[PDB]
Design an enzyme around this catalytic site. Structure first.
Site, mmCIF file in Angstrom:
data_model
loop_
_atom_site.group_PDB
_atom_site.id
_atom_site.type_symbol
_atom_site.label_atom_id
_atom_site.label_comp_id
_atom_site.label_asym_id
_atom_site.label_seq_id
_atom_site.Cartn_x
_atom_site.Cartn_y
_atom_site.Cartn_z
ATOM 1 N N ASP A 7 -2.112 5.463 10.568
ATOM 2 C CA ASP A 7 -1.985 5.213 9.134
ATOM 3 C C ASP A 7 -1.616 3.742 8.999
ATOM 4 O OD1 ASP A 7 -0.789 4.605 6.628
ATOM 5 O OD2 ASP A 7 0.555 6.318 6.665
ATOM 6 N N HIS A 813 -7.109 5.381 -23.426
ATOM 7 C CA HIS A 813 -8.190 4.786 -22.656
ATOM 8 C C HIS A 813 -9.505 4.897 -23.417
#
Length: 1298
Positions: A7, A813
């Site tokens: 990761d 939005h």
RNA sequence: UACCAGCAAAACACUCCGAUGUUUUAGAGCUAGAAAUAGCAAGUUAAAAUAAGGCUAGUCCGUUAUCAACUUGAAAAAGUGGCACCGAGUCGGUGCUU
DNA sequence: CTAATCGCCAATCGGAGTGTTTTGCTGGTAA
DNA sequence: GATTGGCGATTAG
């Protein structure tokens, strides 16, 4: 066997090693050193932490200033070499007293008066010319002999500060009035275009064109008084030419070639001559006049003095500033003295009150002074005439301000020219060296030459025609200038990739256009009634299309092919269905068709095109084509110099016509030109196995260089090297057996806002900024930002809004969040209510679009792609294929950098070559996104919080590994998008959305999951969850911090006044800090542990000492050259050489009870422990802070009293802070009245007291807790030092208590 | 995984130029009073430095990138640390190969 | 002496030119 | 663009 999961991040790397059935093995290791430990047991899971990388801008910004600071000093050295011989007869030491001004009287050798040298001459000189501009104005307008020293002073001041280079050509500071011009202008319009005259409309254009406005406002004011005109009209075009624009003169003159004209570039004369050729000279001085006005209105903010009086309009305008200050000072003093006697002690006598004494002597700007003085002027009577000037910023001005950057360099040259002619009769030596002084001022190195190095620099590319010193007077006879502008561009142009060591062709060449145009036409199909099937195109049709359509227009419309060819020739009513731009320009210019058709005349046009593309200056282009002359005629060259191209393609020349089908005739270019049976494109030619291109093309084609050669920010390219090294370290530990699989996942202000709002307000004409003044730390909130971006007006309703109503308003939005997850300014709008937007599942309604098209177009405002989405309501809207693609992208890692990392790992992992010239896989590399793991955590209640410890970095690699390994082995055919190497949309959407449904039971599935051919056991819902739960709660994770040596600047840059301390550092060798000042903030690179002896007392008692010393960046080389002499000079005696130990930053120590500390410097320490809260409290804390789970939260309430006990117990043996803990306990004792939600939100704030790293301040419900800095590195001298590897499994311990 | 086509959004690397800011010195403060102390008068500009310094002596270079400890090596780096179970105070134990 | 806490500070503003990837609606085409 | 190590004044031994 085993597998590895990684990761990568910008500050951490996590790793884990799973095994057969999702378990983490443990192993016994060996410990070295001289301690009592000989073994240890460890688990295979951990993490690594480091700092962040930076960019190279902050170094370039200083490299490009060190050079200017030293080039400026050489300008004065040249001036002193012309004055030396003559001055050696007036004053023998005039140039010597000018270099010791920064010296105290004791260190001076000559007298302390610089210019003249007596106390009675210096005072007389200072009493006659208070400022330097008085002398400058006197020298120009006088006709008497002057002393040489004054002339030198004036010339030096003029040369040191010279002005800016933004206007090319010659200025003329005689025309200051504006109206004689609007008159002079119209005067001519109707002196040939009579009978139809633009109306002068008695326009007093004085305030129209002379006011301190912008170009657009002057444009609107100009035609305001004229009853009707065109902004695009030719009168408007010439007007815009008068101001700073780029008008085009094709309109109203039926022109075919663009005639863009600019009045500031160094090309106006040639373009004007060319444009006056196709029209004539009948309309001539309608231009000589537009010039006069152009320069008459830009010299309007700096020069504010009259004419027919002086030839120095800049020096004469800086005396008005001096004479308008001495007059206001007396009035202000008297008025304050009379009507306010109690304040005449801090306005004029205090240096820390922002008055008049704190504005001249202390530190304060004009804005602060005005803000402080406004009330006082307002309160008293009188002071009308002074309040107006304060609104114009003309109250008490100084002659060296921050707004002097609008003075051209052509004004300083005129005063120098005027001075050099009045005094050329008394001093003959000024008559000869008159053309050199004017050259020192105006010289400037071109930007395509660079540093004047001699093969000892890394940034230089310049050549030389003769080995000699370079001076401004012989710059053209030494520097080649011919090959210096060719190496500037060819050192950055890309190389080929199918055939290296070859340079690419120009984009606008002739062979490249032949390749590009005819390749497209090799595959096309059209159907008519007569024909039976869609046929292809032949070469003859392509030639005809080129001749008729390409040669009449660069872009060939499909309709042109349909009509001009099909209808005219093939007689087709209807049918269904690249640019040779260089050829048509060459035909127009050369006017010879058979020249270009001839194929013998080659290697000529390519050179011409390369010359036009490469250079930019005009003399260069002319001289390059000078050898390419005598062939056509004299006239063609004048038009050939005017053509310019741009762009570089990506294909070599030898690849096209150097290794072509010499064994079969038809070239690679000609294969796509005259096609036959095998209509094969270039890709088919290269990627097939029937011809002999592959062998030749494949004949041609360190880790740090490869990684540094990638594309991306430097901050992320640091986490790949560490990942590779961690992988190579982990392979060795497990017995030199390569892993089976590898699973990878790569997890990914204010000043811009006030600049944008200021620009929007200025362009919109809004006065809300004056109504509500805004500071620099107010509008970081998005609601008020959006409110001000619209002039406080709703966009869904068309009504004015409120500054404190957005609180009750909404932010929505544009595209619904269910489709696009965007949170930027381009997608968010502020409105009173979202219901006014119209439809909730599409673009806002067409009514809003119709009602706000005008305001959307006005928002030309540069404040807001946003317009396109808002206006999408009239374009039919969205699709589903994009949704399916985005759904795939939400889990498929399509970013290029991840592909680069995967390729880098795969190339080194597999090395065995197949005997059939191939490769065999041994290790799989799998890439996946973070959506799957987040969904798994949410569904199966493996909750996480990020404010307890750093263990969560290493808990994601394990989950990645288990999920990837489980999924890849259950579906053996989904390897196409998950493994490196090489209608329906709705079905794919559903399939990819329900991939992760094989873990759950009911949407009942059997407890045992089997897979196809063998019924492979891939999951068992009776023990695997137990193993995951057991692994997720383990108090053993290897956390390691990376140790680095520090580099950078020496110290702080501020210069401090003189003091009487020993912490100051001298600026030069001979400047004592106790009389001149210096810097004080040294930065330490690393530390050293020394054991030695020092003398004490007058008896020189040789005591034995052992302490820590800090070595700064400034004195590293001296220590690294000879430590013993350095230490002896410091004051130590009999230094033991064999016991000196270096200690970089972030070193680790071990105290009595597992208490560990880091090392930040030679004076401070840090924390090095971690907390291991159990897994029950994490779930409780996560649930409390946010159906049936409420009841569970309510029943289990005593957990709020078990966390505090653990925190206190941990802090009573490691942290060792008493007052802070007592305050925390006292605050918690009296606040047990609020419900659980807020108490949990404030308990989460308590984990800042036990966090690894530097101490920091936190805040409880009401109380504020400060820091607990540790400031004594004395206890660590009797502890153990630990050295660790990259993973932390290998370590050595050294006892310092010997 | 590559080649042409419209625009927009960016991000990164190198070269050539302007205007301020800060630190020391010069522009003769006066009247009473032994003294602290009071009363009054002026104030806008100029010179030098701008990472300490280097050798290759150029109108050149000096703040980005790389870096656990021992044994060998000029340098880079070749060689260098035995396996499975249970309990679950940070690891312990047992049984053997070792 | 003499060693440990407490409160404040840290260089900033403009302009011109050349070359290269990577993403987002356009595509096409092809292996 | 905030963080996180330096330096002076006060105060506790």
């Amino acid at each position: 066997k085993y597998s590895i999961g990684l990761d990568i991040g910008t500050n951490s790397v996590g790793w884990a090693v799973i095994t057969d059935e999702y378990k983490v093995p443990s192993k016994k290791f060996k410990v070295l050193g001289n301690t009592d430990r000989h073994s240890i047991k460890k688990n295979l899971i951990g993490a690594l932490l480091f700092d962040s990388g930076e960019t190279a801008e902050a170094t370039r910004l200083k490299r490009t200033a060190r050079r200017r600071y030293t080039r400026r000093k050489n300008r004065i050295c040249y001036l002193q070499e012309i004055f030396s011989n003559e001055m050696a007869k007036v004053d023998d030491s005039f140039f010597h007293r000018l270099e010791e001004s920064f010296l105290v009287e004791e260190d001076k050798k000559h007298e302390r008066h610089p210019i003249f040298g007596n106390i009675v001459d210096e005072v007389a000189y200072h009493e006659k010319y208070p400022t330097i501009y008085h002398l400058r104005k006197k020298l120009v307008d006088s006709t008497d002999k002057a002393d040489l020293r004054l002339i030198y002073l004036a010339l030096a001041h003029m040369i040191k500060f010279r002005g800016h280079f933004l206007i090319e050509g010659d200025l003329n500071p005689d025309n200051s009035d504006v109206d004689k011009l609007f008159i002079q202008l119209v005067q001519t319009y109707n002196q040939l275009f009579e009978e139809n005259p633009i109306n002068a409309s008695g326009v007093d254009a004085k305030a129209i064109l002379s006011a301190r406005l912008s170009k657009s406002r002057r444009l609107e004011n100009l035609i305001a008084q004229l009853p009707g005109e065109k902004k695009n009209g030719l009168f408007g075009n010439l007007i815009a030419l008068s101001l700073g624009l780029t008008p085009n003169f094709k309109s109203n003159f039926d022109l075919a070639e663009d005639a863009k004209l600019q009045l500031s570039k160094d090309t106006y004369d040639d373009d004007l001559d060319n444009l006056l050729a196709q029209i004539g000279d009948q309309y001539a001085d309608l231009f000589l006049a537009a010039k006069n006005l152009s320069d008459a209105i830009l010299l309007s903010d700096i020069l504010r003095v009259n004419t027919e009086i002086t030839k120095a309009p800049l020096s004469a305008s800086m005396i008005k500033r001096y004479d308008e200050h001495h007059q206001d000072l007396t009035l202000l003093k008297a008025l304050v003295r009379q009507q306010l006697p109690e304040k005449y002690k801090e306005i004029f006598f205090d240096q820390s009150k922002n008055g008049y004494a704190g504005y001249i002597d202390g530190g304060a700007s004009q804005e602060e002074f005005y803000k402080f003085i406004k009330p006082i002027l307002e309160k008293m009577d009188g002071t009308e005439e002074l309040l107006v000037k304060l609104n114009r910023e003309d109250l008490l001005r100084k002659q060296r301000t921050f707004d002097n950057g609008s003075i051209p360099h052509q004004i300083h040259l005129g005063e120098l020219h005027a001075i050099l002619r009045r005094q050329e009769d008394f001093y003959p030596f000024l008559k000869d060296n008159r053309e050199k002084i004017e050259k020192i001022l105006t010289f400037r190195i071109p930007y395509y030459v660079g540093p004047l190095a001699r093969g000892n620099s890394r940034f230089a590319w310049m050549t030389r025609k003769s080995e000699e010193t370079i001076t401004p007077w012989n710059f053209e006879e030494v520097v080649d200038k011919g090959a210096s502008a060719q190496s500037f561009i060819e050192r950055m142009t890309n190389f080929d990739k199918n055939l290296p060591n070859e340079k690419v062709l120009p984009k606008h060449s002739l062979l490249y256009e032949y390749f590009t145009v005819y390749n497209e036409l090799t595959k096309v199909k059209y159907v008519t009634e007569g024909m039976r099937k869609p046929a292809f195109l032949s070469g003859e049709q392509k030639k005809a299309i080129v001749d008729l359509l390409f040669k009449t227009n660069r872009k060939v419309t499909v309709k042109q092919l349909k009509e001009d060819y099909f209808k005219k020739i093939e007689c087709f009513d209807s049918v269904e269905i690249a640019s040779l731009g260089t050829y048509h320009d060459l035909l127009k210019i050369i006017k010879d068709k058979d020249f270009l058709d001839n194929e013998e005349n080659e290697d000529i046009l390519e050179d011409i095109v390369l010359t036009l593309t490469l250079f930019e200056d005009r003399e260069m282009i002319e001289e390059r084509l000078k050898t390419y002359a005598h062939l056509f005629d004299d006239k063609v060259m004048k038009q050939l110099k005017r053509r310019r191209y741009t762009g570089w393609g990506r294909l070599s020349r030898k690849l096209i016509n150097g290794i072509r089908d010499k064994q079969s005739g038809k070239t690679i270019l000609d294969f796509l030109k005259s096609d036959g049976f095998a209509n094969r494109n270039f890709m088919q030619l290269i990627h097939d196995d029937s011809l002999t291109f592959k062998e030749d093309i494949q004949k041609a084609q360190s880790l740090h260089e490869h990684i540094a050669n990638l594309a991306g920010s430097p901050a992320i390219k640091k986490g790949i090297l560490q990942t590779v090294k961690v992988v190579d370290e982990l392979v060795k530990v497990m017995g030199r057996h390569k892993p089976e699989n590898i699973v990878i996942e790569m997890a990914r202000n204010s000043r811009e806002r006030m600049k944008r709002i200021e620009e929007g307000i200025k362009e919109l004409g809004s006065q809300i900024l004056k109504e509500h003044p805004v500071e620099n730390t107010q509008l970081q909130n998005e609601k008020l930002y959006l409110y001000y971006l619209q002039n406080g007006r709703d966009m869904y309703v068309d009504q004015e809004l409120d500054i404190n109503r957005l609180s009750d308003y909404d932010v929505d939005h544009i595209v619904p969040q269910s489709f696009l997850k965007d949170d930027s300014i381009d997608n968010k709008v502020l409105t009173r209510s979202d219901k006014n937007r119209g439809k909730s599942d599409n673009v806002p309604s067409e009514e809003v679009v119709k009602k706000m098209k005008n305001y959307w177009r006005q928002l030309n405002a540069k404040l807001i792609r946003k317009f396109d989405n808002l206006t999408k309501a009239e374009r039919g809207g969205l699709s589903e294929l994009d949704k399916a693609g985005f759904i795939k992208r939400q889990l498929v890692e399509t970013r290029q950098i991840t592909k680069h990392v995967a390729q880098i790992l795969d190339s080194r992992m597999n090395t065995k070559y197949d005997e059939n010239d191939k490769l065999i896989r041994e290790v799989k590399v799998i890439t996946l996104k973070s959506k799957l793991v987040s969904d798994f955590r949410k569904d199966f209640q493996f909750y996480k919080v990020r404010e307890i410890n750093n263990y969560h970095h290493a808990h994601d690699a394990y989950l990645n590994a288990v999920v990837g390994t489980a999924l890849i082995k259950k579906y053996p055919k989904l390897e196409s998008e998950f493994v490196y190497g090489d209608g329906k949309a709705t079905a794919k959407y559903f399939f990819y959305s329900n991939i992760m449904n094989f873990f759950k039971t009911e949407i009942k599935r059997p407890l045992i999951e089997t897979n196809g051919e063998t019924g492979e056991i891939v999951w068992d819902k009776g023990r695997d969850f137990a193993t995951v739960r057991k692994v997720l709660s383990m108090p053993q994770v290897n956390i390691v911090k990376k140790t680095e040596v520090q580099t950078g600047g020496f110290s702080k840059e501020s210069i401090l006044p003189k003091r009487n301390s020993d912490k100051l550092i001298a600026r030069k060798k001979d400047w004592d800090p106790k009389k001149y000042g210096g810097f004080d903030s040294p930065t330490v690179a690393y530390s050293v542990l020394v054991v030695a002896k020092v003398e004490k007392g007058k008896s020189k008692k040789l005591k034995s000492v052992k302490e820590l010393l800090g070595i700064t960046i400034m004195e590293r080389s001296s220590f690294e050259k000879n430590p013993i002499d350095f230490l002896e000079a410091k004051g130590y005696k009999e230094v033991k050489k064999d016991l000196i130990i270096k200690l970089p930053k972030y070193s680790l120590f071990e105290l009595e009870n597992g208490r560990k500390r880091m090392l930040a410097s030679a004076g401070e320490l840090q924390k090095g422990n971690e907390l291991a809260l159990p897994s029950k409290y994490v779930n409780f804390l996560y649930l409390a802070s946010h159906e049936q789970k409420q009841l569970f939260v309510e029943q289990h309430k005593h957990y709020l009293d078990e966390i505090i006990e653990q925190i206190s117990e941990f802090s009573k043996r490691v942290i060792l802070a008493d007052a802070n803990l007592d305050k925390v306990l006292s605050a918690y004792n009296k606040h047990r009245d609020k419900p659980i939600r807020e108490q949990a939100e404030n308990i989460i704030h308590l984990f800042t007291l036990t966090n690894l790293g530097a101490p920091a301040a936190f805040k409880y419900f009401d109380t504020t807790i400060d820091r607990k800095r540790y400031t004594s590195t004395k206890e660590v001298l009797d502890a153990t030092l630990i050295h660790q590897s990259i993973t932390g499994l290998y370590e050595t311990r050294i006892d310092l208590s010997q």
